[PDB]
Design a protein around this ligand. Structure first.
Ligand code: U1D
Ligand code: U1D
Lengths: 304, 304
């Protein structure tokens, strides 16, 4: 029993973090096989950040300008290329700690673990979601860029995020491991406003299921509703619209708890309309939307 | 910017988790040097849990009854002994992944990372506090016993918790790595009620400092108070009494933010008396008490 915002074990990723230094800019890189992946803005001065021409900046850089340190051992760079907003540094040594891995571009609402790093050294691990406005609500200081988000399926690490940006509102933007930004964000010091941060409705319902499973049931009511009725209420409260897909994904939690998805929707509807009245659900005073249905099954069934 | 419930990287501990099986009971052990540490109730049947005589139960067990598997490789047990509520299994192989480590018994209010494990395999990592009633609010399923709580100071893992028990209220009890229970709990299937779960006042103030640093300041007020006045309000709300020690520990956060501890106390007092009025602080609708002042400094200064 008990339900916790749980990250994946970070060991497999700890073994991949290196320090990349280009002139006086240092940040984190990801060493997989004989490639080190890092934010292309490693080649920039903070001066450069205002309107950088990465193609032109990169012409001035050679393999030997890219200082890659793995713990205390320097890697030899035999190749460099820019893919979207990441650099790939070919090194002469395969990372002996390369786990089985994939690069996956995630959908908004999907959750992942971040290994926050500074100077290629891990400081901590926390769980995130890709917000519907393609920001993440991270914990990132200067030097944190190149820290990666990931999922683990048994022994395979799926890398989904590399950290690049803080927006002036203190939220986080970055890329998949192909260096394509989530959302409309660019690696440039400019006016970039986040859109509406909407609640991930399907994740809230998942977390309502997790609560019932762990004995928090005060919010279960006598009512039901319909997808269309529920969605009218969701619109009003800047909740994502709930689809039949979301209902299907909640099927197993529905089945295990014996509470129909649309009944749980009617519970959520009442919580939106009436608030929590100073009560709590799994030790939270607001509706948690950063557990997926997959996350709830996993944590409730002890998948390793 | 951004503030997150952050665990330590779990890699150094992942390398220490093994599976211990005694007859038909399996749980997790901690392999450090040539010793595997595990809950002594590994020797019990669930029948046994009602009123176990561990000394008598253990007389019936030999080294070869303790099946220790490290990933997929069996360790040879050359010795076993009971220290308080843990077993120490001497194995013929030093764990090659033994990090620098210590066993430390923590104080209530102190925070640590849990690597939740099943069958000696990591499933996840989350941050905890030792509650003032010596419970932790964990996420633990059957087979999770032997999962450990820890802190990391640069390269040294201080093990502070081994998981043993769920109380009938779904909260968690366990031991330091000498096998002494935190609080009055025994490894026995019996009436064990937790005492008052009081709020860790000094941690809440630390988290109020973390909020100001990260731009959440709506709750900063025009008032101040005194240790004695504040404590009258703390009593009423089942907050731990605030000592001059707590004030001293908050000194650096005080200094960095330029908000005197007693002014922040007067802010906390108003929040207790008036609630949050539907507002949030670092994305939480209640007062978080599972960051220490040390945790806030660390996360705000990017210590690795
Ligand atoms: C993000 C990090 O830890 N290292 N690099 C930086 O500090 C910057 C990244 C960007 C900046 S400054 C300006 C906007 C574009 C990305
Ligand atoms: C805790 C775990 O994952 N493995 N062991 C158990 O399930 C039990 C531990 C205790 C039980 S059952 C009864 C109370 C005493 C501790």
């Amino acid at each position: 029993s008990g339900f916790r915002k749980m990250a994946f074990p970070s060991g497999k990723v700890e073994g991949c973090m290196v320090q990349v230094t280009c002139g006086t800019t240092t940040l984190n890189g990801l060493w997989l096989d004989d490639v080190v992946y890092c934010p292309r803005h490693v080649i920039c001065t903070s001066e450069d950040m205002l309107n950088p021409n990465y193609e032109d900046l990169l012409i001035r850089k050679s393999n030997h300008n890219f200082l890659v340190q793995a713990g205390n051992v320097q890697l030899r760079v035999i190749g460099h290329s820019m893919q979207n907003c990441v650099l790939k540094l070919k090194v002469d040594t395969a990372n002996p700690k390369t786990p089985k891995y994939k690069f996956v571009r995630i959908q908004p609402g999907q959750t992942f673990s971040v290994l926050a790093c500074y100077n290629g050294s891990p400081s901590g691990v926390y769980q995130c979601a890709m917000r519907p406005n393609f920001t993440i609500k991270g914990s990132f200081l200067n030097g944190s860029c190149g820290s990666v988000g990931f999922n683990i399926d048994y022994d395979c690490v799926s890398f989904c995020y590399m950290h690049h940006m803080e927006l002036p509102t203190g939220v986080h933007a970055g890329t998949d491991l192909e260096g394509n930004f989530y959302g409309p964000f660019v690696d440039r010091q400019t006016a970039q406003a986040a859109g509406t941060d909407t609640t991930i409705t399907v994740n809230v319902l998942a977390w309502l299921y997790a609560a019932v499973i762990n004995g928090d049931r005060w919010f279960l009511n006598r009512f039901t509703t319909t997808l269309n009725d529920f969605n009218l209420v969701a619109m009003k409260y800047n909740y994502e619209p709930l689809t039949q897909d979301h209902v299907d994904i909640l099927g197993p939690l529905s089945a295990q708890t014996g509470i129909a998805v649309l009944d749980m929707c009617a519970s959520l509807k009442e919580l939106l309309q009436n608030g929590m009245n100073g009560r709590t659900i799994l030790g939270s005073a607001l509706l948690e939307d950063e557990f997926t249905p997959f996350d709830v099954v996993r944590q409730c069934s002890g998948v390793t």
